[PDB]
Design an enzyme around this catalytic site. Structure first.
Site, PDB file in Angstrom:
ATOM      1  N   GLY A   1       1.609   5.310   1.923  1.00 10.26           N
ATOM      2  CA  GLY A   1       1.825   6.313   3.060  1.00 10.26           C
ATOM      3  C   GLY A   1       1.630   7.770   2.662  1.00 10.26           C
ATOM      4  O   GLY A   1       1.481   8.113   1.530  1.00 10.26           O
TER       5      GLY A   1
ATOM      6  N   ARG B   1     -12.891  -1.439   6.442  1.00 13.80           N
ATOM      7  CA  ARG B   1     -11.537  -1.337   5.664  1.00 13.80           C
ATOM      8  C   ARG B   1     -10.293  -0.952   6.570  1.00 13.80           C
ATOM      9  O   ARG B   1      -9.045  -1.180   6.246  1.00 13.80           O
ATOM     10  CB  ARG B   1     -11.480  -0.215   4.545  1.00 13.80           C
ATOM     11  CG  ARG B   1     -11.554   1.327   4.911  1.00 13.80           C
ATOM     12  CD  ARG B   1     -11.804   2.164   3.780  1.00 13.80           C
ATOM     13  NE  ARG B   1     -12.684   3.333   4.353  1.00 13.80           N
ATOM     14  CZ  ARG B   1     -13.782   3.509   4.402  1.00 13.80           C
ATOM     15  NH1 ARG B   1     -14.550   2.920   4.090  1.00 13.80           N
ATOM     16  NH2 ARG B   1     -14.238   4.696   4.802  1.00 13.80           N
ATOM     17  N   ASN B   2     -10.630  -0.279   7.649  1.00 15.28           N
ATOM     18  CA  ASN B   2      -9.707   0.026   8.661  1.00 15.28           C
ATOM     19  C   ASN B   2      -9.478  -0.910   9.936  1.00 15.28           C
ATOM     20  O   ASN B   2      -8.853  -0.493  10.982  1.00 15.28           O
ATOM     21  CB  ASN B   2      -9.681   1.521   9.283  1.00 15.28           C
ATOM     22  CG  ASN B   2      -9.223   2.331   8.281  1.00 15.28           C
ATOM     23  OD1 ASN B   2      -8.290   2.184   7.534  1.00 15.28           O
ATOM     24  ND2 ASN B   2      -9.822   3.504   8.144  1.00 15.28           N
TER      25      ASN B   2
ATOM     26  N   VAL C   1       3.913   1.338   1.987  1.00 15.16           N
ATOM     27  CA  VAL C   1       3.903   0.420   3.009  1.00 15.16           C
ATOM     28  C   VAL C   1       4.220  -0.887   2.478  1.00 15.16           C
ATOM     29  O   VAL C   1       3.828  -1.391   1.371  1.00 15.16           O
ATOM     30  CB  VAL C   1       2.566   0.490   3.605  1.00 15.16           C
ATOM     31  CG1 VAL C   1       2.187  -0.541   4.647  1.00 15.16           C
ATOM     32  CG2 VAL C   1       2.083   1.924   4.047  1.00 15.16           C
TER      33      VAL C   1
ATOM     34  N   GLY D   1       0.860  -1.366   0.114  1.00 11.46           N
ATOM     35  CA  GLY D   1       0.274  -0.027  -0.007  1.00 11.46           C
ATOM     36  C   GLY D   1       0.916   1.284   0.010  1.00 11.46           C
ATOM     37  O   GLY D   1       1.887   1.136  -0.170  1.00 11.46           O
TER      38      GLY D   1
ATOM     39  N   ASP E   1     -12.179   7.526  11.187  1.00 13.38           N
ATOM     40  CA  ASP E   1     -12.186   6.986  10.076  1.00 13.38           C
ATOM     41  C   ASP E   1     -12.482   5.459  10.408  1.00 13.38           C
ATOM     42  O   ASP E   1     -12.050   4.631   9.522  1.00 13.38           O
ATOM     43  CB  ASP E   1     -11.065   7.176   9.154  1.00 13.38           C
ATOM     44  CG  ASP E   1     -11.151   6.544   7.734  1.00 13.38           C
ATOM     45  OD1 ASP E   1     -12.399   6.588   7.351  1.00 13.38           O
ATOM     46  OD2 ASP E   1     -10.185   6.365   7.010  1.00 13.38           O
TER      47      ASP E   1
ATOM     48  N   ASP F   1      -5.555   2.212  11.467  1.00 11.78           N
ATOM     49  CA  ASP F   1      -5.829   3.515  10.697  1.00 11.78           C
ATOM     50  C   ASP F   1      -4.880   3.747   9.430  1.00 11.78           C
ATOM     51  O   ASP F   1      -3.606   3.845   9.768  1.00 11.78           O
ATOM     52  CB  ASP F   1      -6.101   4.862  11.394  1.00 11.78           C
ATOM     53  CG  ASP F   1      -6.748   5.951  10.743  1.00 11.78           C
ATOM     54  OD1 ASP F   1      -6.586   5.793   9.280  1.00 11.78           O
ATOM     55  OD2 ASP F   1      -6.914   7.092  11.085  1.00 11.78           O
TER      56      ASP F   1
HETATM   57  C1  LIG Z   1       2.571  -0.220   9.384  1.00  6.56           C
HETATM   58  C2  LIG Z   1       1.695   0.382   9.804  1.00  6.56           C
HETATM   59  C3  LIG Z   1       1.544   1.693  10.204  1.00  6.56           C
HETATM   60  C4  LIG Z   1       0.314   2.343  10.783  1.00  6.56           C
HETATM   61  C5  LIG Z   1      -0.553   1.668  11.085  1.00  6.56           C
HETATM   62  C6  LIG Z   1      -1.775   2.111  11.765  1.00  6.56           C
HETATM   63  O1  LIG Z   1      -2.841   1.459  11.908  1.00  6.56           O
HETATM   64  N1  LIG Z   1      -1.751   3.267  12.545  1.00  6.56           N
HETATM   65  C7  LIG Z   1      -2.588   3.695  13.385  1.00  6.56           C
HETATM   66  C8  LIG Z   1      -3.657   3.125  14.069  1.00  6.56           C
HETATM   67  C9  LIG Z   1      -4.328   3.890  15.137  1.00  6.56           C
HETATM   68 CL1  LIG Z   1      -5.666   3.063  15.860  1.00  6.56          CL
HETATM   69  C10 LIG Z   1      -3.932   5.017  15.549  1.00  6.56           C
HETATM   70  C11 LIG Z   1      -3.083   5.782  15.129  1.00  6.56           C
HETATM   71 CL2  LIG Z   1      -2.484   7.353  15.799  1.00  6.56          CL
HETATM   72  C12 LIG Z   1      -2.191   5.240  14.009  1.00  6.56           C
HETATM   73  C13 LIG Z   1      -0.911   0.330  10.666  1.00  6.56           C
HETATM   74  C14 LIG Z   1       0.365  -0.308  10.034  1.00  6.56           C
HETATM   75  N2  LIG Z   1       0.169  -1.638   9.685  1.00  6.56           N
HETATM   76  C15 LIG Z   1      -0.704  -2.280   8.831  1.00  6.56           C
HETATM   77  N3  LIG Z   1      -0.916  -1.519   7.435  1.00  6.56           N
HETATM   78  C16 LIG Z   1      -1.213  -2.090   6.586  1.00  6.56           C
HETATM   79  C17 LIG Z   1      -1.533  -1.012   5.415  1.00  6.56           C
HETATM   80  C18 LIG Z   1      -2.149  -1.456   4.283  1.00  6.56           C
HETATM   81  C19 LIG Z   1      -2.121  -0.810   3.125  1.00  6.56           C
HETATM   82  C20 LIG Z   1      -2.083   0.480   3.535  1.00  6.56           C
HETATM   83  N4  LIG Z   1      -1.680   1.030   4.541  1.00  6.56           N
HETATM   84  C21 LIG Z   1      -1.487   0.175   5.502  1.00  6.56           C
HETATM   85  N5  LIG Z   1      -1.452  -3.484   6.527  1.00  6.56           N
HETATM   86  C22 LIG Z   1      -1.189  -4.128   7.575  1.00  6.56           C
HETATM   87  C23 LIG Z   1      -0.551  -3.546   8.686  1.00  6.56           C
HETATM   88  C24 LIG Z   1      -0.452  -4.722   9.312  1.00  6.56           C
HETATM   89  N6  LIG Z   1      -1.004  -5.893   8.723  1.00  6.56           N
HETATM   90  N7  LIG Z   1      -1.260  -5.522   7.807  1.00  6.56           N
HETATM   91  C25 LIG Z   1      -1.809  -6.285   6.377  1.00  6.56           C
END
Ligand SMILES: Cc1ccc(C(=O)Nc2cc(Cl)cc(Cl)c2)cc1Nc1nc(-c2cccnc2)nc2c1cnn2C
Length: 268
Positions: A18, A134-135, A23, A16, A130, A148
């Site tokens: 960022g 999807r999140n 990502v 994905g 959000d 998120d």
């Molecule tokens: C690396 C990372 C960074 C940030 C966040 C996040 O949730 N930040 C967050 C949450 C909250 Cl509740 C509050 C605040 Cl402040 C921040 C999540 C991940 N991890 C994942 N992201 C994605 C992904 C896919 C496509 C596009 N973007 C991301 N796929 C994944 C992950 C783990 N497994 N998979 C299959």
């Protein structure tokens, strides 16, 4: 926040995008699979503040239903946010690809987990803004973890759309929509209605109809999440408590709300 040395991280595949970086799925040595968000050369000051600020907030979260931060790379470039990896991916796609495969009790269990994560966030004074299937990420134990990924009219409470009032109570509205997504196996809220048509319908009092095979108690709860008056919506503590009691007395889920047939088939 736990600082990870770059030599311990192997980026494998892009999954994905960022804010100013990509990502990835990869491996972390300490190998565990991980997800990796990078901040690439040329990022602005504001992007750096938001990126490190996100890492810092994520590092303060410790809850079964919130995505877990493994660590951060801040001392070397590119900077990275590194989380646990969730094998089954995002919940909306997961349910659409597994239509009809789970029990009602499993689906309601998913919602209880999401609600517990949201109760935690709200108590921690974190407004999500959000919340949508999807999140939400799903692991190999069917545990749902609120996440998120960045950028939602159809999921957003009226006061948040109208005058930008985002609170845990607008998150409750979104949670109601997530309940409908789960019980329909990932149907699109309001189907083909346009964004303007959705808002007009909501303002005129219409609400999403019950999913098929939906427990009466579950539809009643999602309906109360969609009260126009923010103060009348349940708090997340109320939602968690109700869902926990329904699960622990599972016969309570056998009473189903009437499904309004869109199509009539007449056979002898
Ligand atoms: C690396 C990372 C960074 C940030 C966040 C996040 O949730 N930040 C967050 C949450 C909250 Cl509740 C509050 C605040 Cl402040 C921040 C999540 C991940 N991890 C994942 N992201 C994605 C992904 C896919 C496509 C596009 N973007 C991301 N796929 C994944 C992950 C783990 N497994 N998979 C299959």
């Amino acid at each position: 926040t736990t600082e990870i040395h770059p030599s311990c991280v192997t980026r494998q595949k892009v999954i994905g995008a960022g804010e100013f970086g990509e990502v990835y799925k990869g491996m972390l040595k300490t190998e565990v699979p991980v997800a990796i968000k990078t901040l690439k050369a040329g990022y602005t000051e504001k992007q750096r503040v938001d990126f490190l600020g996100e890492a810092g907030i994520m590092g303060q979260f410790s809850h079964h239903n919130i995505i877990r931060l493994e660590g951060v790379i801040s001392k070397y470039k590119p900077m990275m946010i590194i989380t646990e990896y969730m094998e089954n991916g995002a919940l909306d796609k997961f349910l659409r690809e597994k239509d009809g495969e789970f029990s009602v009790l499993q689906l309601v269990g998913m919602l209880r987990g999401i609600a517990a994560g949201m109760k935690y966030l709200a108590n921690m004074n974190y407004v999500h803004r959000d919340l949508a299937a999807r999140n939400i990420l799903v692991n190999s134990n069917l545990v749902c973890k609120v996440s998120d990924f960045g950028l939602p009219i159809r999921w957003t409470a009226p006061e948040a759309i109208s005058y930008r009032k985002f609170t845990s109570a607008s998150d409750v509205w979104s949670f109601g929509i997530v309940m409908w997504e789960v019980m329909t196996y990932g149907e699109r809220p309001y189907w083909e209605l346009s964004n303007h048509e959705v808002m007009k319908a909501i303002n005129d009092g219409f609400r999403l109809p019950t999913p098929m095979d939906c427990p009466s108690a579950i539809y009643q709860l999602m309906m109360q999440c969609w009260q126009q008056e923010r103060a009348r919506r349940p708090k997340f503590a109320d939602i968690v408590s109700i869902l926990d009691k329904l699960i622990r007395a599972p016969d309570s889920l056998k009473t189903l709300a009437d499904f309004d047939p869109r199509v009539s088939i007449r056979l002898p």
